[PDB]
Design a protein around this nucleic acid. Structure first.
Length: 99
RNA sequence: GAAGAA
């Protein structure tokens, strides 16, 4: 079947950017930042939204200022509970920032 | 009556 480096998403690798999945529709970027900034410094946080209704799609991303604090948070928050939903967490394979 | 790369 189909397969490619950094296109596959069930086999991530370390990155300052983390993805967060399973979220409740009432979660804000501020709740994610208060829950993840206890593991280290965070420059930004962004929830992913529907284009026609502006509701959350159930996933988001968290941008640390260091890969080793992202390696901490990725192991800390994977399988935790937030607003009555379990969340899962992994390193970003791709991201909106670029340099 | 998916909880996954924007």
């Amino acid at each position: 079947g189909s397969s490619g480096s950094s296109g596959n998403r069930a086999n991530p690798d370390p990155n300052c950017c983390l993805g967060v999945f399973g979220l409740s529709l009432y979660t804000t970027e501020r709740d994610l930042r208060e829950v993840f900034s206890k593991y280290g410094p965070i420059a930004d946080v962004s929830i992913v939204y529907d284009q026609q209704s502006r509701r959350s799609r159930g996933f988001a991303f968290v941008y640390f200022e260091n890969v080793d604090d992202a390696k901490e948070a990725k192991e800390r928050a994977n399988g935790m509970e937030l607003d009555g939903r379990r969340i899962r967490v992994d390193f970003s394979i791709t991201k909106r920032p670029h340099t």
